[PDB]
C-alpha cells in the first residue's frame, strides 16, 4: 500500500572494485604494501547459495596489474646494461655437461666474467648476448630480495569477500557453505612452470577443475592433497666480481670443480600422487596416459622455479613418462613474457638449498588421453588459491512494501 525504504539490508550484487595490500608483522620486496594484520573476523553464513566463477574473476587481473606495477617500480631505480654490446671473446669452460658455460672477456673501455653457453647467441670465436640492441637488459638491485613473502588481500568499505569452506568444490558451480571475511589468509604465491610449489593445500580426496574440460586449448589444474617434499641442491661454489663501466655485480670464476646442478625427488610420494590423480583422470571413460610437453623453446617444456633469488630450469620430462632430474641454470630471463626488456638476474655466492613442497599440478589436454603438462601461464597458478575468494559490492538500500497508515 505504501513504499518504504530499509537501511542496513544484507544484500549484495556483483561489481568491480579496487583492493589493497595487507601483510603480517615484518622487521616481492614489499616496501610499498601496508603490513597490517588486524584481528581476523570470520563470520559464517547460513542458507546462502551464491555461484562462484574464478575463471571470469576480476581480482586476479587486479592483483596481476598490482604485482607487475610493483615489479616495474622496483626495477626502475636499478642501473641498465644497454652500452654492453661490445664484441666478446668466448673460448671454453674454465664429468658430463661441461660445455654449458664459457667465460668470456669484454672491453668496457679489460675484464672477464663467467657466462653460460645458452646465455649467448651462437654468432658463427666471436660471440654476443641473446639481445643487446632493440631489447634492453635491466639488472636487479641486490639491496632487496624478491623472496616469496606471505601477504593478505582486504577490500575497502562497501565491499566484502565471500569465502567457501566446502572442500569438494571446483571453480564453477554453486557454493552452499559460504562465509564472509574481510581479509584473506596468509597466501604465499610463487612463480613456477608445470608445478605450484608453495601454496595452500586441499583436504578430502583429489580435486580437478577447468573452464570447459572439452577444448584442448584450455588448461586443467589439479590441486594435490599430500605435499611432496621437493628441496633440490645446487652443487656449485662460484665467485663474485665487480667491474666498473655501474658496479656490474656478477660471478668471476669457479673455485674447485664444475658440476651441473641436479637432484632427486621421492619415488614413493610421486607414485602415490600419480596413482591418486590417475584414479580421477579416467572420470568426466577413455584410457589415460602421461606424456611430456609438445616442445617449443625453453622454460615451457621443462620445470622452471626460483630458489632464493636464483632461477632453476629442471628437466622433468622423465617424470611424466613410462628419481634424478638434470637441471640447467641461466641468468638471463624474460619475465612476464616481455619483448624488448630483459632481466640480468646475477647469481649468489656459495651453494643454495631451499625447502619447498608440492600443492598443485598443471595439465594440458592433447587433441586428436595423453594428458601432457605445460601451459606456461601464471594466471592459473595464482588462481589455484584464489578459487575460494570473490569480491562483491553491498547495497543496503532495500525497498519493502508495507501498509504505513
Amino acid at each position, epitope marked *: 500500500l505504501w513504499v518504504t525504504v530499509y537501511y542496513g539490508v544484507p544484500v549484495w550484487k556483483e561489481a568491480k572494485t579496487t583492493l589493497f595490500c595487507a601483510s603480517d608483522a615484518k622487521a616481492w620486496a614489499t616496501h610499498a604494501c601496508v603490513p597490517t594484520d588486524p584481528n581476523p573476523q570470520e563470520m559464517v553464513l547460513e542458507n546462502v547459495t551464491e555461484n562462484f566463477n574464478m575463471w571470469k574473476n576480476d581480482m586476479v587481473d587486479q592483483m596481476h*596489474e598490482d604485482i*607487475i606495477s610493483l615489479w616495474d617500480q622496483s626495477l626502475k631505480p636499478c642501473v641498465k646494461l644497454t652500452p654492453l654490446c661490445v664484441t666478446l671473446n668466448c673460448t671454453n669452460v674454465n664429468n658430463n655437461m661441461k660445455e654449458e658455460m664459457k667465460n668470456c672477456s669484454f672491453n668496457t673501455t679489460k675484464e672477464y666474467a663467467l657466462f653460460y653457453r645458452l646465455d649467448i647467441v651462437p654468432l658463427n670465436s666471436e660471440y654476443r648476448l641473446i639481445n643487446c640492441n*632493440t631489447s634492453t637488459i635491466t639488472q636487479i638491485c641486490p639491496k632487496v630480495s624478491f623472496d616469496p613473502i606471505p601477504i593478505h588481500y582486504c577490500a575497502p568499505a562497501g565491499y566484502a569477500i565471500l569465502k567457501c569452506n566446502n572442500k569438494t568444490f571446483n571453480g564453477t558451480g554453486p557454493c552452499n557453505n559460504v562465509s564472509t571475511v574481510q581479509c584473506t589468509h596468509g597466501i604465499k604465491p610463487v612463480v613456477s612452470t608445470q608445478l605450484l610449489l608453495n601454496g595452500s593445500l586441499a583436504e578430502e580426496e583429489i580435486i580437478i577443475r577447468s573452464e570447459n574440460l572439452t577444448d584442448n586449448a584450455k588448461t586443467i589444474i589439479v590441486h594435490l592433497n599430500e605435499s611432496v617434499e621437493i628441496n633440490c641442491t645446487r652443487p656449485n661454489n662460484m665467485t663474485r666480481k665487480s667491474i666498473r663501466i655501474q658496479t656490474f655485480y656478477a660471478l668471476g670464476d669457479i673455485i674447485g670443480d664444475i658440476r651441473q646442478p641436479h637432484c632427486n625427488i621421492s619415488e614413493a610420494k610421486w607414485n602415490k600422487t600419480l596413482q591418486r590423480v590417475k584414479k580421477k583422470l579416467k572420470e568426466h571413460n577413455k584410457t589415460i596416459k602421461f606424456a611430456p610437453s609438445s616442445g*617449443g*623453446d*625453453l622454460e*615451457i617444456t621443462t620445470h622452471s622455479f626460483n630458489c632464493r633469488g636464483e632461477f632453476f630450469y629442471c628437466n622433468t620430462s622423465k617424470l611424466f613418462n613410462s628419481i634424478t632430474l638434470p637441471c640447467r641454470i641461466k641468468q638471463i630471463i624474460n619475465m612476464w613474457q*616481455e619483448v624488448g626488456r630483459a632481466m640480468y638476474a646475477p647469481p649468489i655466492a656459495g651453494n643454495i638449498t631451499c625447502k619447498s613442497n608440492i600443492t598443485g599440478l598443471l595439465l*594440458t589436454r592433447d587433441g586428436g588421453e595423453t594428458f601432457r603438462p605445460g*601451459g606456461g601461464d601464471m594466471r592459473d597458478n595464482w588462481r589455484s588459491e584464489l578459487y575460494k575468494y570473490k569480491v562483491v559490492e553491498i547495497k543496503p538500500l532495500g525497498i519493502a512494501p508495507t501498509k504505513c497508515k
Partner: antibody, heavy 126, light 107 residues
Framework: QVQLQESGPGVVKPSETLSLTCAVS??????????WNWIRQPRGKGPEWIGG????????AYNPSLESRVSISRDTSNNRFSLNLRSVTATDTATYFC?????????????????WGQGLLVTVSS | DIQMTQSPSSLSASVGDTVTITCRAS??????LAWYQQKPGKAPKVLIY???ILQSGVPSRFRGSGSGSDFTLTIGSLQIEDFATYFC?????????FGGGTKVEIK
C-alpha cells in the same frame, strides 16, 4: 567478438607530429597477455612493424629503424590507445592498421596477430 | 637484422588445384613462423600460426609444415574464397618482419 576501430585525419602534411588513435570494443585494454600492435601496409610490398605497447606494464618496443620518432601512449579510460609519430616526410604513407596480438601456448615470448582493424589511408601531400 | 624473403613472386593455377608457397629465412628460427591471408581490400586475417597449429575457424584444406629456416605451406583445395595474397611473418623477437608477398592467378 572483439572489434577494432580506428579514427584520424585523412590528409596529413609532412614535417609535423602525426597522431593516430584506435578504439577497442568488447575486450579490455588490461586483459591477460596482449599487445596493442601498430603496423602499416604500404602499397607495393608487404607490411612493416612500427611498435607495440604492453597491456599492463605499459612497457614498449620499437622498430630498429624508427627510434626517437615514435611514442606510443595509452590510457585506461575510454577503452582506447593512441600512437604518436614524428617526421612523417614522404616515407610514412599509405594505410595504417591497429591490430592485436595474443600469446602462443606452444612457446614462451611468441606473439602473433589474430585480430585486425579496417585500415585508415594516410595521404601525404603538399 | 633478421631479413625475410619470399620466392617465387607469383604462380598460376586453376580451381581445386594444389598451391605450394615457400618462405626462406636468414637463420634458423625453429617453428616461430605464422601465415596470413590478405584478400583484395580491407584488413587481412591470420591463417596458420606456429607453422603447425591451425586456427579456430579456418577450413581443413590448408596445411603447413617446416622447421629451422626452410618452410613450405601447401593447400589441399583452392576455392573461390581462397584467391588472395599470402604473407609469412616471423616473430622471433623485435622486429616483426613480414614476407615478400605472393599472389595467385587464374588462366
Amino acid at each position: 567478438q572483439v572489434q577494432l576501430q580506428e579514427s584520424g585525419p585523412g590528409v596529413v602534411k609532412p614535417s609535423e607530429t602525426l597522431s593516430l588513435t584506435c578504439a577497442v570494443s568488447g575486450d579490455s585494454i588490461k586483459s591477460a597477455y596482449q599487445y596493442w600492435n601498430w603496423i602499416r601496409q604500404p602499397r607495393g610490398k608487404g607490411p612493416e612493424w612500427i611498435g607495440g605497447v604492453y597491456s599492463s606494464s605499459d612497457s614498449t618496443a620499437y622498430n630498429p629503424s624508427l627510434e626517437s620518432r615514435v611514442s606510443i601512449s595509452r590510457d585506461t579510460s575510454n577503452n582506447r590507445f593512441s600512437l604518436n609519430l614524428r617526421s612523417v616526410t614522404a616515407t610514412d604513407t599509405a594505410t595504417y592498421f591497429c591490430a592485436r596480438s595474443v600469446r602462443d601456448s606452444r612457446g614462451w615470448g611468441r606473439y602473433f596477430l589474430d585480430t585486425w582493424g579496417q585500415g585508415l589511408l594516410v595521404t601525404v601531400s603538399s | 637484422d633478421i631479413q625475410m624473403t619470399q620466392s617465387p613472386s607469383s604462380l598460376s593455377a586453376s580451381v581445386g588445384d594444389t598451391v605450394t608457397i615457400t618462405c626462406r629465412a636468414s637463420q634458423s628460427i625453429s617453428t616461430w613462423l605464422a601465415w596470413y591471408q590478405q584478400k583484395p581490400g580491407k584488413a587481412p586475417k591470420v591463417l596458420i600460426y606456429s607453422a603447425s597449429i591451425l586456427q579456430s575457424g579456418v577450413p581443413s584444406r590448408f596445411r603447413g609444415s617446416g622447421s629451422g629456416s626452410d618452410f613450405t605451406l601447401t593447400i589441399g583445395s583452392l576455392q573461390i574464397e581462397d584467391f588472395a595474397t599470402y604473407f609469412c611473418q616471423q616473430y622471433t623477437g623485435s622486429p616483426f618482419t613480414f614476407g615478400g608477398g605472393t599472389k595467385v592467378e587464374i588462366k
